[PDB]
Amino acid sequence: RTHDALLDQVKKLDLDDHPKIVKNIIKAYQPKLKEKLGKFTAVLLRHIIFLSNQNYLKNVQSFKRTQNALISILKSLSEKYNRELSEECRDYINEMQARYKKNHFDALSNGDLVFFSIIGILFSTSDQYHLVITPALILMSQFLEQIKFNSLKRIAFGAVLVRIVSQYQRISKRYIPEVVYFFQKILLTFIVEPLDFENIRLDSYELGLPLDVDFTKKRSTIIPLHTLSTMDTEAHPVDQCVSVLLNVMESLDATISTVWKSLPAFNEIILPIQQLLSAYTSKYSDFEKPRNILNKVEKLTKFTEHIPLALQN
Amino acid sequence: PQAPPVLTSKDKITKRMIVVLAMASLETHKISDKYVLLNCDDHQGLLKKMGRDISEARPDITHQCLLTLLDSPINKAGKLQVYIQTSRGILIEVNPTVRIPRTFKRFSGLMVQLLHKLSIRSVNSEEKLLKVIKNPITDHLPTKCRKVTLSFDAPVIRVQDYIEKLDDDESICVFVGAMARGKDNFADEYVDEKVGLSNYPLSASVACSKFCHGAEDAWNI
Amino acid sequence: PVLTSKDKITKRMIVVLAMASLETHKIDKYVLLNCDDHQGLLKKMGRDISEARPDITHQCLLTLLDSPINKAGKLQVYIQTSRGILIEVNPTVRIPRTFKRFSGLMVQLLHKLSIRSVNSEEKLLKVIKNPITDHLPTKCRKVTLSFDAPVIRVQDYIEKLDDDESICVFVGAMARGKDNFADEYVDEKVGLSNYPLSASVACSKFCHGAEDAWNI
Amino acid sequence: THLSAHLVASFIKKLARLTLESPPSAIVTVIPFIYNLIRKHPNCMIMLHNPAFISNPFQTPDQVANLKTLKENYVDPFDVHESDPELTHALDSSLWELASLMEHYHPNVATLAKIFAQPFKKLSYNMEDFLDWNYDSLLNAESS
């Protein structure tokens, strides 16, 4: 209850399948006696990340019902204790960014992705300046651009990020200029095998994509279970390449009409992306998502005004 | 964006509107223990001894017009100044920068400060605001001027058409009869024509804003 | 003919002053609440200095009545009070042009809740019940003069109207405050000048544009 | 002091397209730098607004027939592939990209793009104050 390890080591004496209500009984008994839960809410934020880091061989019926309940324990502790969580969420950014200073990828954990998704459900999403979210979103920005995408894991380790970042601005709907840099750096890595684009400065020429996926309606979809998948995506079947791409197609296509449609420079933003999307539909001719994206674009190249501005009035 | 340059009588080149209230009733009387502005309503019995009738001495129509002129956007955009021609002959220059108090009783105390000390200075104190200037008005008007009179017997014209035929440096000056009842002859020796605004008999307050809100559309404000 | 709240067929203009500081105090007699005439009465009651201005109600009414569009009989004026009092005004009324005879005219009306002239043919000032929308004509257009709104020309806005749609304008009369007072009422907010306007001007700037479109 | 309008406007527009895909540390160098050059050369102010396209109330209804049809015939005359800097038609095109940049995820970067709606009140903008920022220095000063 006092230390981050000692409450976990007491939970380590018990089984993880029953460790959830043991903390909840400990959370109730500490409430049955504000000062005790100052430490206890800090341990729960570390420990919930730690269960994602530890192991994930337990399925959704074996882990996530125990995992989402522990998040639901924090939900009853969040609304009373925002002074406690702001002290940990400020420091865990300061911890993990300083760990990123140590290693460009090695101190980056697969459980660290959950830390931002916890906050966006807990804290106030729509705000301009939030003392937790705005250090996090500017860390996520660093976490987008700087890391070197040379394996399919890091692609999936970045494919989760857009799905996290767009939930921050499903309601704020602000602009994020690195995400178009994030998408362009993804789309040509699968078509490396070119002459139209020397501008993108991609990381590794190694991974590509042959014209060999069948891409059915039964083809595997988004469903990102990272601590099942990402540790072993490098043992590579051909299906798991396209399915990660097929998320990024849809995490693009959803966020166009919510975010990209609003901005006045939308005619000039997407014109590199159209030729990228052209390179899929001209090559394979059997995908349906690029042709549907491009017809969504051909509306929005016609629909908007695209009048030159008179800002100095 | 910056503030447009605040006009005075000293500048005489810049094109602008001038709205002059003529024959205002702004007179000073002493009581004994203080000095007060003259009112028709507040003291009817004082004017019977002085001999000037109650129905003439109305300062309220002036403060009614001074809120009409100063809050209008052509006083924001810097394109008019306003002169006050008192019925006793006093000529009062009004800086566009002043904010005249919107209550009537403070305005009564504002005028009796004016008519003795001859110049009202702001509490910001950068400049003098309401200065009594030497007659005649034809000195302190701008040089290339156009001088008109609002008359109910005049032929009715439209405000926006009349200003658009002015030259690019000529400045309109509108002598407005603030008298509640009287002849439209207070400035026949000054102006070069008489212009009308409506077929209906108007107030002195509306005939300002009937001109001003036509002026702003004629100058694209 | 004289416009009424009963008459709802003819297309006509309506200007409603809103949040006009018209409050009654008792001193024994009754007295209207002035900002200038009594400052400590504002302080001991606790009500703020800058709001209690009944002078603007006197000023705009002389603008609205003496405009020729009221002499043409094309509008009637309603008073929305900071207390929520709603006052129907006869267009043929004749208001104290001095403010101190206008001073008791509130506490005359607000305690009687009705006023009839000495000729006694019909009531002149009539305190009526909220909402204002019950008394307006059935095909009506309601707006609010706001400085932050987009600026329009007055004459072009009224020529676009149908032949039977009554224009109603809710003018805020506070010295300062929020202009959100009629958002449950109006279609939109409109602007008239590039400069912040007095309500005396904002009545006249709307009226003298409305006079042109109706050839008065 | 010699350079043309077309020479300077090509660099302002090409760096403006470059800001669309850029780290925010690379934005706090460009927005001062575009702010200096337009203040140096106010002839290229025409790309921040073309006042033939503004709408007055006090313009003629026959011009509304013109102004409706004139906006419909606009095309973007800019050519990225052209490398001769005076030959590129950046003067005849605006730069929407800085106007989009007012909506930004970081506040202080969104603050500096909001200069371009406000007037051009000052000139000496001191780029060495705004030049060297980094992802580390953005995070280290934010808690500070």
Give contacts of D58 with chain B, Cβ < 8 Å.
217, 220
Q: Rounded distance, CA A189 to CA A203, Å?
A: 8
Of the partner residues B41, B70, B102, the one whose CB lies closest to the CB of residue C53: B102
In this complex, is the C-beta atom of A126 within 8 Å of any C-beta atom belonging to chain D?
A: no
C vs A contact (3+ beta-carbon pairs below 8 A): no
Q: Which residue has the tokens 């994509």?
A: A209
Task: Tell me the DSSP string of A216-270.
Answer: -SSS------HHHHTTSSSS--HHHHHHHHHHHHHHHHHHIIIIITTSTTHHHHS
Residue A49 token pair: 């990340």
The H or E element containing residue B213 is helix B204-218
Between strands B91-94 and B80-86, the pairing is antiparallel
Q: What is the CA radius of gyration of chain C?
A: 17
Task: Tell me the DSSP string of B54-90.
Answer: TTT---HHHHHHHHHHHTSHHHHTT-EEEEEEETTS-
Touching chains, B (3+ CB pairs < 8 A): C, D
Q: Are C123 and C114 in contact (CB under 8 A)?
A: yes
Q: What is the number of other CB atoms lying within 10 angstroms of the CB of residue A20?
A: 20
Query: Is C179 annotated among the ligand-binding residues?
Result: yes
Determine whether the interchain pair C156/D57 forms a contact, defined as Cβ–Cβ distance below 8 Å.
yes
In this complex, is the C-beta atom of D105 within 8 Å of any C-beta atom belonging to chain C?
A: no
Which of A285, A290, A104, A276 has the alpha carbon at shortest distance from A190? A276
Q: Which residue has the tokens 């002169």?
A: B83
Q: Rounded distance, CA C20 to CA C96, Å?
A: 17
Q: Rounded distance, CA B40 to CA B62, Å?
A: 13
CA angle (B140 as vertex; B137, B143 as ends), nearest 5: 110
Residue C129 token pair: 């019940």
Which residue of A175, A183, A309, A313 to mutate against D (max D Cβ within 10 Å)? A309
Q: Are A145 and A84 in contact (CB under 8 A)?
A: no
Residue B102 one-letter amino acid: R
**Phi, psi values for residue C188, rounded to 5°:** -160, -175
Angle between helices B204-218 and C199-213 (to 10 degrees): 70
Q: Are D136 and D143 in contact (CB under 8 A)?
A: no
Q: Are A177 and D104 in contact (CB under 8 A)?
A: yes
- For chain C, the distance separating the N- and C-terminal CA atoms, rounded to the nearest angstrom, is 16
Q: What is the CA radius of gyration of chain D?
A: 17
Residue A1 token pair: 């209850």
> Please, which residues 80-109 of chain B have a Cβ atom closer than 8 Å to chain C?
102-106
Residue of D nearest to C155 (CA): D57
Which of D9, D8, D27, D1 has the alpha carbon at shortest distance from D90? D9
How many CA atoms within 13 Å lie on the side-chain side of D88?
19
Which of D90, D15, D55, C152 has the alpha carbon at shortest distance from A305? D55
Residue A208 token pair: 């590509």
Torsion angle defined by CA atoms of residues B153, B158, B164 and B170, in that order, rounded to the nearest 10 degrees: 30
Q: Rounded distance, CA B107 to CA D72, Å?
A: 56
CA angle (C49 as vertex; C48, C52 as ends), nearest 5: 85
**Residues contacting D12, CB < 8 A, separation 6+:** D34, D37, D38, D44, D47, D90, D95
State the burial class of residue A304 (Cβ atoms within 10 Å of its Cβ: 0-12, 13-18, 19+). Answer: middle
Buried-exposed string D39-75: b where 16+ CB fall within 10 A, e elsewhere: eebeebebbbbbeeeeeeeeeeeeeeeebeeeeeeee
Of the partner residues C55, C196, C204, the one whose CB lies closest to the CB of residue B213: C204
Give contacts of C200 with chain B, Cβ < 8 Å.
64, 67-68, 71, 205, 209
Q: Which residue has the tokens 């006090």?
A: D58
The H or E element containing residue C107 is helix C99-112
Alpha-carbon distance values, D39 to C49, D12, D32 (Å): 46, 12, 10
Alpha-carbon distance values, D17 to A307, B126, C195, D6, D12 (Å): 17, 49, 38, 16, 9
Q: Which residue has the tokens 């919510």?
A: A258
* d(CA B2, nearest CA chain D) in Å: 9
Give contacts of C153 with chain D, Cβ < 8 Å.
57-58
Which residue numbers in chain B precede an interruption (C–N > 2.5 Å)? 32
In this complex, is the C-beta atom of D58 within 8 Å of any C-beta atom belonging to chain C?
A: yes
Q: Which residue has the tokens 């007491």?
A: A10
In this complex, is the C-beta atom of D51 within 8 Å of any C-beta atom belonging to chain C?
A: no
Query: Is B202 annotated among the ligand-binding residues?
Result: yes
Residue B134 DSSP label: P
Q: Are A66 and A16 in contact (CB under 8 A)?
A: yes
Task: Tell me the DSSP string of A6-57.
Answer: HHHHHHHHS-TTSHHHHHHHHHHHHHH---HHHHHHHHHHHHHHHHHHH---
Q: Which residue has the tokens 């007295």?
A: C31
Alpha-carbon distance values, B9 to B83, B132, B138 (Å): 10, 12, 11
Helices (H), B133-178: 137-140, 159-164
Q: What is the number of other CB atoms lying within 10 angstroms of the CB of residue C117?
A: 14
Residue B87 one-letter amino acid: S
Q: Are B175 and C173 in contact (CB under 8 A)?
A: no
- For chain D, the distance separating the N- and C-terminal CA atoms, rounded to the nearest angstrom, is 41
Alpha-carbon distance values, A302 to A266, A295, A297, C206 (Å): 11, 11, 8, 39
Determine whether the interchain pair B209/C195 forms a contact, defined as Cβ–Cβ distance below 8 Å.
no
Q: What is the number of other CB atoms lying within 10 angstroms of the CB of residue A291?
A: 14
User: Is cis: bond before A210, omega within 30 of 0?
Assistant: no
Which of B185, D140, D86, B32 has the alpha carbon at shortest distance from A100? D140
CA dihedral over D31, D36, D39, D42, signed as positive or negative: negative
Determine whether the interchain pair A177/D119 forms a contact, defined as Cβ–Cβ distance below 8 Å.
no
Which of B60, B151, B67, B172 has the alpha carbon at shortest distance from B111? B60
Q: What is the resolution of this structure in A?
A: 4.9
Which of D23, D16, C205, B87 has the alpha carbon at shortest distance from A185? D23
Method: cryo-EM
Determine whether the interchain pair C175/B213 forms a contact, defined as Cβ–Cβ distance below 8 Å.
no
In this complex, is the C-beta atom of C208 within 8 Å of any C-beta atom belonging to chain B?
A: yes
Q: Which residue has the tokens 């998502």?
A: A289
**Residues contacting B44, CB < 8 A, separation 6+:** B54
In this complex, is the C-beta atom of D56 within 8 Å of any C-beta atom belonging to chain B?
A: yes
State the burial class of residue A155 (Cβ atoms within 10 Å of its Cβ: 0-12, 13-18, 19+). Answer: buried
CA dihedral over C113, C115, C120, C123, signed as positive or negative: negative
